[PDB]
Amino acid sequence: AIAQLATEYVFSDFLLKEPTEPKFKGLRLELAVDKMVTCIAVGLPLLLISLAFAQEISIGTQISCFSPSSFSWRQAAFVDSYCWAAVQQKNSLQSESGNLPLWLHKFFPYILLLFAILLYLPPLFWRFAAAPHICSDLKFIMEELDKVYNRAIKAAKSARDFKYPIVEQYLKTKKNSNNLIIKYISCRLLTLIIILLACIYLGYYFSLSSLSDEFVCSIKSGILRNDSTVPDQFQCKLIAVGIFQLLSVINLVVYVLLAPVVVYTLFVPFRQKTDVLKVYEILPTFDVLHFKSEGYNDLSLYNLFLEENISEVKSYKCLKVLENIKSSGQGIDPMLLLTNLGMI
Amino acid sequence: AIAQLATEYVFSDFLLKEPTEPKFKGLRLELAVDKMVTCIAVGLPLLLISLAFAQEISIGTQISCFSPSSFSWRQAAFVDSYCWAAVQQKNSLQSESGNLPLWLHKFFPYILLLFAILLYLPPLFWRFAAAPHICSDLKFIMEELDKVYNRAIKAAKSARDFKYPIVEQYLKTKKNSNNLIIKYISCRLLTLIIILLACIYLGYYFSLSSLSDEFVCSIKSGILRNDSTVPDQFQCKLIAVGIFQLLSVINLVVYVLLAPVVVYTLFVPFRQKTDVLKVYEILPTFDVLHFKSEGYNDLSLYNLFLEENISEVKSYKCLKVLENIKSSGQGIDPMLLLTNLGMI
Amino acid sequence: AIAQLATEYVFSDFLLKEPTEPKFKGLRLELAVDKMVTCIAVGLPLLLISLAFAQEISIGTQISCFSPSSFSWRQAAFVDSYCWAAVQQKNSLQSESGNLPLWLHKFFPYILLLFAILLYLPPLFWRFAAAPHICSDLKFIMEELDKVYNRAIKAAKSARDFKYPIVEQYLKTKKNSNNLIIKYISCRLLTLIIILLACIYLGYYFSLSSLSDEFVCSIKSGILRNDSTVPDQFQCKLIAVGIFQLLSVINLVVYVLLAPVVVYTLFVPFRQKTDVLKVYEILPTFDVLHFKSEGYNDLSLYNLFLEENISEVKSYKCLKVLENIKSSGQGIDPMLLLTNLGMI
Amino acid sequence: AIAQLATEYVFSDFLLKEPTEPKFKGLRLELAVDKMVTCIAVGLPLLLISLAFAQEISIGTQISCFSPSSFSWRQAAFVDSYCWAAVQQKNSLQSESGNLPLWLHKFFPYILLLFAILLYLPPLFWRFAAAPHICSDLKFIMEELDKVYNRAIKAAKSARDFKYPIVEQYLKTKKNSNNLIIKYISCRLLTLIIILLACIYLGYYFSLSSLSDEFVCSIKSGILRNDSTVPDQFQCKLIAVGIFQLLSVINLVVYVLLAPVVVYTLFVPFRQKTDVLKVYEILPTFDVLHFKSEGYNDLSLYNLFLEENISEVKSYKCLKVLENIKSSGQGIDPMLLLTNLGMI
Ligand SMILES: CC(C)CCC[C@@H](C)[C@H]1CC[C@H]2[C@@H]3CC=C4C[C@@H](O)CC[C@]4(C)[C@H]3CC[C@]12C
Ligand SMILES: CC(C)CCC[C@@H](C)[C@H]1CC[C@H]2[C@@H]3CC=C4C[C@@H](O)CC[C@]4(C)[C@H]3CC[C@]12C
Ligand SMILES: CC(C)CCC[C@@H](C)[C@H]1CC[C@H]2[C@@H]3CC=C4C[C@@H](O)CC[C@]4(C)[C@H]3CC[C@]12C
Ligand SMILES: CC(C)CCC[C@@H](C)[C@H]1CC[C@H]2[C@@H]3CC=C4C[C@@H](O)CC[C@]4(C)[C@H]3CC[C@]12C
Ligand SMILES: CC(C)CCC[C@@H](C)[C@H]1CC[C@H]2[C@@H]3CC=C4C[C@@H](O)CC[C@]4(C)[C@H]3CC[C@]12C
Ligand SMILES: CC(C)CCC[C@@H](C)[C@H]1CC[C@H]2[C@@H]3CC=C4C[C@@H](O)CC[C@]4(C)[C@H]3CC[C@]12C
Ligand SMILES: CC(C)CCC[C@@H](C)[C@H]1CC[C@H]2[C@@H]3CC=C4C[C@@H](O)CC[C@]4(C)[C@H]3CC[C@]12C
Ligand SMILES: CC(C)CCC[C@@H](C)[C@H]1CC[C@H]2[C@@H]3CC=C4C[C@@H](O)CC[C@]4(C)[C@H]3CC[C@]12C
Ligand SMILES: *[C@@H]1O[C@H](CO)[C@@H](O)[C@H](O)[C@H]1NC(C)=O
Ligand SMILES: *[C@@H]1O[C@H](CO)[C@@H](O)[C@H](O)[C@H]1NC(C)=O
Ligand SMILES: *[C@@H]1O[C@H](CO)[C@@H](O)[C@H](O)[C@H]1NC(C)=O
Ligand SMILES: *[C@@H]1O[C@H](CO)[C@@H](O)[C@H](O)[C@H]1NC(C)=O
Structure with missing residues (x-):
C-alpha cells in the first residue's frame, strides 16, 4: 500500500543503517549532507516507481487497445499484449510523437x-x-586525543597535589596527500552529473504532449497480414503515463533542489570551518597549532569528518564546555579542567 | 485489514521508536508534545490512505464508465482505464466542476x-x-548533576563522621546562544504552515459538490475520433470520492485541533516553568542561582528538555522527594539527604 | 515490486555477508574487487530476471496466439498453452527465424x-x-605481527627505563608453494570464460530480428489433424521478448565492462605493490627483509590479502602512522613508537 | 520468483547449516565433498521442481483438452480436470506412448x-x-593434542630456564573397529545407487517422443457414456512436459558428473593421505609413530575427519608452520617451538 511504501522509504532507516560490523562502532563514515543527498536521490525514484503502480492509483493493465466488439476477450488480450511488445517494433505501430515516447512510457x-x-x-x-x-x-x-587529554589531566592533578605531537604530525602529513579528497570530489561530481542527466530525462519526459501514450497498433504481420476480419489498426493507450509524468516532474523538482547541495558539497574547503581542534589548543600536553584550512587536500575532508563525528568523544565535549565557559572568562581553563575530572 | 492498519499506526510504536543507538540511551531528544504532534500529523493521513482503499470499504475499481451493452468486457475496461488516464487530458473529458476536482480525486x-x-x-x-x-x-x-550530588553527600557524610559551578556556567553560556531555539522555532513554524496548507486543501476538497466525481469521458481521439459504433461520450464516476471527502474532513478536524498545540509549542518561554534546577539549590556544593527564565534563547529549550527527561536521574529524584518533604518542614534538608544515602 | 527487487539485490548485502562463523572474525577472505565482480556477475542476471516479469512491466501471459472469434476462452487458452509447450516441438510450429530463437525466448x-x-x-x-x-x-x-610489535615496544620501554623471524620464514616458505595462487587463477579464469560465453549468448540473443518472437503454431496433431473447424495455423507472439533483449544487452554491457576487471585480477603479481610489510622493517625485533614481489606464487596472493585486511591490526596502523610522520623526518621512529604506547 | 528460488537453494546456506547445538561447536561432522554431494543431489531436484512451475515459465494450467466451441467454460474445465484425474484410469484415455508416460508427466x-x-x-x-x-x-x-602440545612447550620452557601416549593408543584401538567406516561406506553406496536409479529414470523420461504429453481423453463413463452431444474424445496436452524433460536432462547431467565423486568418496583409504599427525611427531612429549594408512577401518575415516577439521586447532597450526619453516632448515624445531609461545 501507499502508506507501507512511505514507511519503508521515508519513515524507516532506508540506507540510513550504520555499518553492521564492529570495525566502525559509532563512526558515521559519511557526512550527514552526503547521506541525505544519497538517501533522497536513491529512495525518491524507488518511491515513485512503487507509487505509480500502487493498487489504488492503478486502474489495472498498463495498456488497452479497444478491440472490436466481435473480438473475444482473449483476442483483445492478444491485441493488447502484442501492442505492448510492439512498442519496440517500429513497423507495427505508427504514432505521431514517434516511438521513443512509447519506449519511455513502457520502461x-x-x-x-x-x-x-x-x-x-x-x-x-x-x-x-x-x-x-x-x-x-x-x-x-580520536584515541590519540583521548590519551593526550588523559595525560594532561593527570599532569594537572599531579601538579595540584615523550610529549611528542604525534597526532599533529599525522594531520600535517595528511595535509600533503590528496587521494581521499580526490575520490570524494570524483564521486560527488559523478553523482551531480547523474542527477543532471536524470533532470534532463525527466524534463523531456514531462514535456511530452500527453497524447503520445495513445499510439496506433497493427497486428498485421505473419498470417494475419492479409486477413480481412481483423481491422487494419487499433487504438491503444498506455495507462499510467500521466502518473509517470507527474512523478517525473516531482523527481525533477527534487533533483534540481538537491543539485545545489551537491555543488556546495563539492567545495569542501569552504565547508572546512569552525575548527574542531581549536578547542584542544588550551591543553598543556597539546601543541598550540591548528594548521588545517585553505587546501584541496585530505586534511580538509578529515576536518569535516572530525566536526561530524567528534561529539562522541568525552574529552572533546569537556574541552568544548570549557571553551564555552571561557566566553565569560570568570574562571581559569586549567582550574576548570582539573575540577571536571572527566578522564573516562 | 482495517484492524491491522489500526494496530500498525495507532496501537503500535509508529514513529515512537527511541533512537536505535548507544549514543542516546534513555534520552527522548524530542518533547512529548512535539512527538505527539508529529505522530498524529504523519500517521493520520497514512491511516486514512490505508482506510480509503481497505478491502472492505472498497467496492472494487476506482472508476466505472458504464459502457454500452454492446461493448465487450475489455472494451469497457479500455473505456474505464482511458478515462482514468484522461482525467489529466482536459480535452477528453468535460465536467461541470472542471478538471482540478478530477485531478484531486485521482491523486x-x-x-x-x-x-x-x-x-x-x-x-x-x-x-x-x-x-x-x-x-x-x-x-x-546530567553527569555533572550526579557528580555534584555525590560530592555533596560525601561532604555531608564526612562532616557527620575546585568547588566550581561548571554546570551553572555552562547553562549561563547557553543563555546567550540561540541557534538551537531558532532551529526549533523554525521547524515548528514550518510544521504549522504545512498543517494550515493541508487544512486549506482538505476544506476545499470536502467543499466539492460531491458530484464532481461524475465526469463525461470521450474516447474520440485518434482513429476512433470519427468512428460511429462508439458513443460520443460515456458516464464515468470516480468511486471512493465520498470516502476521500469523509476522511479529508476527519483530517481537517484533527489538524485544526492540533494547530493550537503547535502554536502553544512555539511559545517556548511560557512553557519554561516549574524550575527543574530549583530543587538542586539546597545542595551546599551547588550555587544558589537558577537564572533560567524569560528568554528567546536556547536556555529555555534546555530547561524544557531537562524537565522532560530528568526523571531518569536518581539524584534529581532524591532532591525532589526532599523538596516535597520540606513542604511540611518537619525535618531538615541536610539530615534527610544524609539519611537517604542515594549516591548510586 | 521493482523497488523491492532493487533493495534486495543492489541496496542490500546480497552476497556481501561476511562468513557467519567465529572462525573468520573480521577476515574478508575475498578481495574487494573479486567480491564486487562476483556480486555483479551473479545479482545482475537475477535482477534482470526479476525485472522482466515484474507486475508492472508484464502485460500478462507470456504468449498469445489470437484464436478465432468463434473459439471460446478455454479453446484459445488451449491454443496458447499448446504453442507454449510446442516451441520445443519443431513440427508443430514453422517460424522464419527457426526454433532456436523460440527456445531462447522461452528459457x-x-x-x-x-x-x-x-x-x-x-x-x-x-x-x-x-x-x-x-x-x-x-x-x-597477524598474531605474530602483533606479538613482535608488543615485544619490540616492551624492549624499547625497558631500554628507556629467541628473537627468531618466524613470520618471515613462513612467508619465505609460502614463496615456494603455489597451490593457492593456482586455484585463485583457475577460478578467475573460469569466471572470465563464463562471462565471455554469457556475452556471446547475450549478443546473439540481442541480434535477433525482434520478429522471431512471432511464430506460426499448428494444433493439428492427433484427432485434430484432420478437423475442419480449427484453422490450419495461428499467429502466436512471445510477449516480453523485447524486454528480454533490452535486459540482455544491458547484461552484455555490464559483463564486457567487467571482463577487463577480471583480466586485471588474473595478473596478481602486478597487483602486488605498496609493500604492506615495508612498514614493519623499522622494528628492531623484526628483520629488515621484505622479499615479496615478482612471483607467480602464493606469496603475492598473501601480500594482496594482507594489504586488504591488515587495517584491522592496531600494530600495523601504529607503524603506518609512524611511517607517515617519518615523511617529514622531524622526530625519530623509536621515540615515536615509545611515545605511542599502543601495545593493545 | 526464479531469483528467489536461486537465492534459497544455491546462494543460501541450504543444508549447509552447522549443527544448531553446543555439543558440536565448530565441528563439521561431514566431509566437504560429502556435504557438497548431498547439497547438490538434494537441492538440485527441488530447484528444478520450483523452476518448472515458476510464474514466468508457466503459461497456466498443466493440461488443456480443447473442448468444442459449444462447450461452456466449466464444461471445458470439467473435461480438463477429468482427463487430469484419468491419466491414471487407463480405459478413459488412449495414447500411443501408453499410460506410463502420462503418469510420469503428471507426477x-x-x-x-x-x-x-x-x-x-x-x-x-x-x-x-x-x-x-x-x-x-x-x-x-583435539583436547589431547592441545594438552600434549601445552605439556611439551612447558617442558621446553622449563629446560630453557605419566608421559603416556593415550591419544596414540586410542587411534591404534580405532584401527581395529570398523563400524563407523562400514556405516559411511553403506550410506555412500546407497546414495550412489539412488543417484544411478535417478539417472536411469531421467534418461527414460527425456527419451520420450515429446508427443506422449498429447493423449486422447474420453469422458464417456457413467450417464455420459451414451450421450450424443458430447464428442467421443478430446485432444488433451500436458503442458510443461518439455520443461520437465529439459530439467530432467539437466539433473541427469549433474548426477552423472556427481557419481564419479561418490565413487571416489567410497575409496576412503586412497583419500587418506597427507598425514595430519606427522607434524606432531617432532614433539618430545609425543611418540614418533603415525601408524595410520592402508586400512578399510575407522582409522582412515578419522584421519579424513582430522585433516578436514584440524585447522581450528592452534597447536596443530603452530606445528604446521614449524614444519613449513623446517623445509629450509635454517633454524631448529625446539627453538622455534619455544620462541612461538603459543600455549593458548
Ligand atoms: C540520461 C541521458 C543519457 C539522457 C539524454 C537525453 C534524452 C532523455 C533525450 C532528450 C532529448 C532527446 C533527443 C531530442 C531530439 C532528437 C532528434 C530525433 O530525430 C532523434 C532523437 C533525438 C536525438 C532525441 C534523443 C533522446 C534525447 C537526447
Ligand atoms: C537540470 C535542469 C537544467 C533541467 C531542466 C529541464 C530542461 C533541461 C528541459 C525542460 C524542457 C526540455 C525541452 C522540452 C522539449 C524539447 C523539444 C525536443 O524536440 C528536443 C528537446 C527539448 C528542447 C527539451 C530539452 C530539455 C528541456 C529544456
Ligand atoms: C497545499 C496548498 C498549495 C494548497 C493551496 C490551495 C488549493 C488546494 C486550492 C484552494 C482554492 C483553489 C483555487 C480556487 C479558485 C481558482 C480559480 C480558477 O479559475 C483557477 C483555479 C483556482 C486559482 C484554484 C486553484 C487551487 C486552489 C488554490
Ligand atoms: C485552518 C482553517 C482556517 C481551515 C478552514 C477551512 C477553510 C479555509 C475552507 C472551508 C471552505 C473553503 C471554501 C469552499 C469553497 C470555495 C469556493 C471556491 O471557488 C474558492 C475556494 C473556497 C472559497 C474555499 C476556500 C477555503 C475554505 C474557506
Ligand atoms: C554459453 C555458450 C555455450 C553459448 C554458445 C553460443 C550460442 C549462444 C549460439 C551463438 C551462435 C549460434 C550458432 C549460429 C549458427 C548456427 C548454424 C545453424 O545451422 C545451426 C545452429 C548454429 C550452429 C548456432 C548454434 C548456437 C550458437 C553457437
Ligand atoms: C565478449 C564480446 C566480444 C562479445 C561481443 C558480442 C559478439 C560476440 C556478438 C554480437 C553480434 C553477434 C553476431 C550476430 C549475428 C550472427 C549471425 C548468425 O548467423 C551467427 C552468429 C552471429 C555471427 C553473431 C555472433 C556473435 C556476435 C558477433
Ligand atoms: C527408480 C527406478 C525404480 C526406476 C526404474 C526404471 C524406470 C524409470 C523405467 C525404465 C525402463 C522402464 C521399462 C521399459 C519397458 C517396459 C515394458 C512394458 O511392456 C512394461 C513397462 C516396462 C517394464 C518399463 C517399466 C518402467 C521402467 C523400468
Ligand atoms: C547412469 C547412466 C549410465 C545413465 C544413462 C542413461 C541411460 C541409462 C538411458 C538413456 C536412454 C535410455 C533408453 C531410452 C529408450 C529405451 C526404450 C524403452 O523401450 C526401454 C528403455 C530404453 C532402452 C532406455 C533405457 C535407459 C537409457 C539407456
Ligand atoms: C497475404 O496475401 C497477399 C495477397 O496479396 C500476399 O501477397 C501475401 O504473401 C500473403 N501473406 C501471407 C503471410 O501468406
Ligand atoms: C475522421 O473522419 C473525418 C471526416 O470528417 C476526417 O476529417 C478526419 O481526419 C478523420 N480522422 C482520422 C483520424 O482519420
Ligand atoms: C484424419 O483423416 C485423414 C483423411 O485423409 C486420415 O488420413 C487420417 O488418418 C485421420 N487422422 C486421424 C488421427 O484419425
Ligand atoms: C447408454 O445407452 C446404451 C444404449 O445401447 C445402453 O446400453 C447403456 O446401458 C446406457 N448407459 C447408461 C449409463 O444408462
Missing part, C-alpha cells in the same frame, strides 16, 4: 531504477574503497 | 502522502541536525 | 539463472576449499 | 521430491547415528 520504471542504481554506485564505491582507511585513521586520531 | 492518496512527508521532514531535520548537540550537552549536564 | 530466465549459478560456482569453490587455509595462515601472521 | 515433481528425500536419508542417518560418536571422539582427540 519508465526501469529508467528510474537505473538512475537510482547509478546514484547509489558512487556512495558504495566510497564506502567500500575510501571508508575503511578514513575510519582507521579517525579512530586512531 | 488524493498522493496528496496525503505528500503532506505526511512534508510534516515528517522538520522532525527529521531536527533529529539529524540539532539532536546530537543537545543530547551531548544534556548528557554532560 | 531466457533459465539461461540467466544458469549463468549466475556458473559464475557463483568458482567463488563458492574458493570459499569452501582455499579460504580456510588462507584464513588460518593470515590469522597466524 | 514428475513427486518423483524428483522422492529422489531428493531418498538422497537426504543416508546423510540424515549418518548425522543422527554415527555423527555424535565421531564428534565426541574427535573432540577428545
